[PDB]
Prior knowledge:
The structure is a homotetramer. In chain A, 31% of the residues lie in helices and 24% in strands.
Amino acid sequence: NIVTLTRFVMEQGRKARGTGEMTQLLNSLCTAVKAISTAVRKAGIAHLYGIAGKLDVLSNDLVINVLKSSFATCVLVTEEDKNAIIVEPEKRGKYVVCFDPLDGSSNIDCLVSIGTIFGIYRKNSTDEPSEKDALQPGRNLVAAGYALYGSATMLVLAMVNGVNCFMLDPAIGEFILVDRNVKIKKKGSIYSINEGYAKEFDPAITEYIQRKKFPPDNSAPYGARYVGSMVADVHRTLVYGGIFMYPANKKSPKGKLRLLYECNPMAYVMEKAGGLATTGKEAVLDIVPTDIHQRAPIILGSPEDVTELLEIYQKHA
Amino acid sequence: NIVTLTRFVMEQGRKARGTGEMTQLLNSLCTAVKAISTAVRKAGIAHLYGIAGKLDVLSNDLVINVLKSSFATCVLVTEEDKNAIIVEPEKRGKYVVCFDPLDGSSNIDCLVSIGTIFGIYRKNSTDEPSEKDALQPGRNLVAAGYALYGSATMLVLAMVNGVNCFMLDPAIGEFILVDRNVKIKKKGSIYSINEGYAKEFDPAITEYIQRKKFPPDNSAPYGARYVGSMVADVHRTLVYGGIFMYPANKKSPKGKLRLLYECNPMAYVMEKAGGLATTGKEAVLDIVPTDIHQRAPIILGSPEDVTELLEIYQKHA
Amino acid sequence: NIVTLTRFVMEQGRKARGTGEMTQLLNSLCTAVKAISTAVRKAGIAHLYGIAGKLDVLSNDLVINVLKSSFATCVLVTEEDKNAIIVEPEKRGKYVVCFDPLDGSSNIDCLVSIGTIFGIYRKNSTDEPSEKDALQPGRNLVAAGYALYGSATMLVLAMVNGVNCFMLDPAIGEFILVDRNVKIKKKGSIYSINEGYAKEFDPAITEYIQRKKFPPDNSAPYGARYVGSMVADVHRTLVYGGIFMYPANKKSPKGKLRLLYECNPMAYVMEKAGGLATTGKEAVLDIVPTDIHQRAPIILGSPEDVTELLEIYQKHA
Amino acid sequence: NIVTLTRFVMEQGRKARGTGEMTQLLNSLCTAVKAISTAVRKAGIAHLYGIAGKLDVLSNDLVINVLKSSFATCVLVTEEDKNAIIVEPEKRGKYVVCFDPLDGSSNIDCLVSIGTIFGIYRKNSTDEPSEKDALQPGRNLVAAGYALYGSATMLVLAMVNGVNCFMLDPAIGEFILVDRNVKIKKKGSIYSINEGYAKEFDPAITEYIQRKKFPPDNSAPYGARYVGSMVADVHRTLVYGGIFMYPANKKSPKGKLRLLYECNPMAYVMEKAGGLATTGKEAVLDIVPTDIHQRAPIILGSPEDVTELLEIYQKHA
Ligand SMILES: Nc1ncnc2c1ncn2[C@@H]1O[C@H](COP(=O)(O)O)[C@@H](O)[C@H]1O
Ligand SMILES: Nc1ncnc2c1ncn2[C@@H]1O[C@H](COP(=O)(O)O)[C@@H](O)[C@H]1O
Ligand SMILES: Nc1ncnc2c1ncn2[C@@H]1O[C@H](COP(=O)(O)O)[C@@H](O)[C@H]1O
Ligand SMILES: Nc1ncnc2c1ncn2[C@@H]1O[C@H](COP(=O)(O)O)[C@@H](O)[C@H]1O
Ligand SMILES: O=P(O)(O)OC[C@@H]1O[C@H](COP(=O)(O)O)[C@@H](O)[C@@H]1O
Ligand SMILES: O=P(O)(O)OC[C@@H]1O[C@H](COP(=O)(O)O)[C@@H](O)[C@@H]1O
Ligand SMILES: O=P(O)(O)OC[C@@H]1O[C@H](COP(=O)(O)O)[C@@H](O)[C@@H]1O
Ligand SMILES: O=P(O)(O)OC[C@@H]1O[C@H](COP(=O)(O)O)[C@@H](O)[C@@H]1O
Ligand SMILES: [Mn+2]
Ligand SMILES: [Mn+2]
Ligand SMILES: [Mn+2]
Ligand SMILES: [Mn+2]
Ligand SMILES: [Mn+2]
Ligand SMILES: [Mn+2]
Ligand SMILES: [Mn+2]
Ligand SMILES: [Mn+2]
């Protein structure tokens, strides 16, 4: 009575009376993620070192060809590509997929946890597919999630019904369901932000951080954690509780994180888990994109922590 | 031509004219690390989940059994065991090994990078082996290093002639030398500390951090990173430069990190790489321990960043 | 444009407008076979040898629980179980599955190629499921095939549309389609039989063997090969051409190979590949079983070789 | 307590007081075999099949590069190379290694068991190293053995003190000693020969085979097995008992199997295990070669079965 991702995705496709097109897409994703996981953990490196006489790029190529081979997609948006990828009519399906094939790639040389992020939209309209099909607010996501290549490889999948966590068993190449209908804690005890940008923070962020270090009601201060890889920091937030923040600063007054393939998928997982995701002014899922590589500030995590910061944001309104 | 850890270790043992006792110890360690890496990556998890037919206890049991079978050790100090472990005479060798089998075990459920830390001493006084044999300053280390289970598994080994990094190719179970004679950058641009303890920081730390966020000469502030796993944070420091700090506070008036199996091995690695490892008042390696589970404050990293902080400590003295 | 088993099985389920029940069954098989493959290649043996302080049976258990977890089966027949396994009504599906979880298990200690064999029937009737549901001639098979754990792991799947070969990539745990719509050679140059039973052969087998060693028309003699594991010998027959034989002798005047889970699946693969499978008197697929563990003589392979022996069988009629 | 090949090899090199040169050679071999096993099992095949981003040539290139880098060899003889390979002086050691990188390469497409055979000689006459250095009788071997890529990967190493079997645990990339000081049964019950050459067999062989099928004393006839892969057939002989034969015929008036890298290593293994290895007229190991690619007839296995056949040869002399 063990549940594999392949079994789960199929039972769910059957409960929803799907034609099996989204099921083929999710299955292709599972496969791409397993292939990326293997390359990240360096299987075969001995060959590069001459035993018998990139990563970001290889990841992009893997996701793009495996997804195109699903015959379920029409428009693909990648952080690595300037322009959206329109699928050849022969393999054109109805889904639009937005992804960051390898997030935190700058951490690659340090061997810190990295990951893959994706958001799936249904093409809403009937004209020739194009970039415009991707420009949907995150509220229209059919599915979203991410894979974390950390001490172990995990796939977190968020759909209308909720959030589920699948652990990769690399011995048999199968994702096993380990956590069902995951719900984030109402209040955590960890805050996560790059405090190296202190001089640049707006007054509301500055004050919140201060409340966390020197609590006015004399409660225990929060612990700090900042891996520097969104997927690692968010996954920790989901599982442990707390808050993650990447607000605006000189690094663009618009934030650093990209809306379509970084913020939306994560905001979607968070909301399905019972938490919040805001830019400080509005909910991330409601922003209407105007550019596929548009950035946006984001704050996400346990609802009580997110609301507390929102209140401060109001005080400085 | 490729160099595996196995060949490198033997070659070095040949040049040093050893009786092959330390060579066996080092081969044993390598085997234990590969075994732990496999467990950490979750191979075989499907069996816990009933495809019909604890990670730190297992790790501890792997290091202990595998080290004893090397017939090269007489005293073992584990973070997991209260008293030192005296090997039976039949299996006695001349080495004392101090290790943390799985560090960052809190971070396990969140899939954050974890690692194994070890330090190797040679039995000095030949009386019946005992706990006191482990009570040697870190300056007396023969070898030290760590295994990081991050996006990929890496083993860093430091000995008198330098520091070398070996990446694990899990396809063939062999560590390949990928970085030779490693040296840390003189000056970095990342600081790593849990600022959630700001309320309890002594003045020197407070000044240094603030100097990093608001550089007097309006230069770029340092970026911040704090994984919460020493092996991860220290490895990023060695590889990319910067400074790592875990000073004394209230909950830990003498620091949290233990001297024999966390601070010493890392201080040794940092020193051979050209960095510094201080308590703020003194070099970590010169401290003569009095308890096997003793704690110590530690600041390590690029020489220029550590020196700068030390200048500040002096100023408040 | 790579085809995985998971993709293939789904497209085929969709072309056939299945409810997705047989698709879930085939997917469970893929998973069980990957798990058996891993245990056969000895992953984890170090643990049995005390690194930190059956196979036939484990295989049976794996197939039985994974199949029962598919919710697509009602009756299971295993070589390892005296009685057929009736599925608990909660997980009862409509398929009957006959399998040998690990064939050639006596070769296990010698590390010779071994394999798994299965035949799938649709329950034909409407009363309580029972052993009687399995007693269908092989001509009523919906699907049949086998997995060979040899120098590499391969899954050969035979369905109404033909035979396809899938190679297991153990790095990503995915079966990849490597040979489509496989057809056996009309005439091969290898014969396979245990000649240690010479004294026991009937006159027709005796004469055929003689024709192969000393060809009456002076053509080159055939080469001999007999691995001793049916799946290995049959797979070689399919891929290379030729004939495989296990006729009657003192080892039961009825042959050794079991009809339901050894001969039928193989006879079915052979026929779909364009070859023949006979007991010498009748086609294997047409025999009406009377016992789930009933044995039957079998001869299979390239059509021209099988007909030649059948002619001799007639001459001695 | 567990014994890995790495530890065993070093331990034996310590007891023998070697300079560690052969120890390095043996560690190199182990690494090369693990690499070949991985390629053979087809890891990464999905890449040949375009998840977008020869086995004997590769094997040959792995053994050669990996052996040269051991700095322990001066002359290499491969089944794949016409002339002996003279290592550059910079990498010269004192050992001559004769090997078949991938034996049974015909059997590759059929996924039948394949293996690697090697024999190690010590350079006797210290003149500039050359081909003649490999032309030593098998009685002069320092070490020999083979790696079998069957259902599991095994390495059999024979040296003056005996034969030991090591099973590869692919999860941790380590060979574990599983059978110590192996000895072959005195008398077996399986004979292995390609009876497809019956027409060309000399009288002695003819009589022996017929004696196996129709034992004069009406005892049980011998079972027959002929995988077609020497490593597989010879390994089953060593492990289960019996006799393996590849005598001279017409297509091969001096046998098919080569003396330096197929017959000698196996004869050496058989002898240390308590079996016999003869040409029919003489012991294989006593033959002084005159060509590096020389062929030789070979009969090996349990002493009683081999003796019996030898008695028969004598009778027809
Ligand atoms: N495996 C699945 N899991 C959950 N929902 C699914 C699945 N397949 C299809 N659906 C749902 O049904 C809709 C159409 O399915 P489809 O015909 O495959 O495009 C989707 O867009 C989802 O809303
Ligand atoms: N593998 C090696 N690598 C570096 N130094 C070695 C090695 N083996 C032995 N040595 C050194 O030589 C001393 C004695 O070696 P041993 O006889 O093996 O106990 C050791 O403590 C080290 O200082
Ligand atoms: N994946 C599949 N591949 C080939 N045929 C299928 C598949 N699924 C179902 N079928 C066929 O359709 C019938 C009923 O499918 P099902 O509703 O799943 O039981 C089967 O018994 C087959 O004949
Ligand atoms: N690992 C070992 N196992 C068994 N014998 C060894 C080992 N190492 C060296 N010897 C033996 O000692 C001789 C010289 O060793 P060496 O100095 O390494 O070249 C060898 O030829 C073998 O006879
Ligand atoms: O994948 P990218 O585009 O290289 O950047 C990773 C992102 O960069 C953020 C950290 O940026 P800072 O260094 O500015 O904190 C992380 O949350 C995100 O993963
Ligand atoms: O869980 P461990 O084995 O005690 O390790 C925790 C240690 O804890 C440090 C961080 O602790 P804080 O949460 O107090 O920052 C790390 O740098 C060390 O890995
Ligand atoms: O799986 P089993 O029941 O142990 O037997 C294997 C079978 O046994 C036959 C060989 O039997 P002989 O030794 O009689 O040739 C092979 O074709 C079959 O795989
Ligand atoms: O393909 P190779 O490397 O030449 O090996 C074939 C050899 O061939 C023998 C069998 O050959 P026959 O087909 O002539 O029996 C085996 O025993 C040896 O493995
Ligand atoms: Mn990216
Ligand atoms: Mn990114
Ligand atoms: Mn620990
Ligand atoms: Mn610790
Ligand atoms: Mn069986
Ligand atoms: Mn069987
Ligand atoms: Mn070869
Ligand atoms: Mn050969």
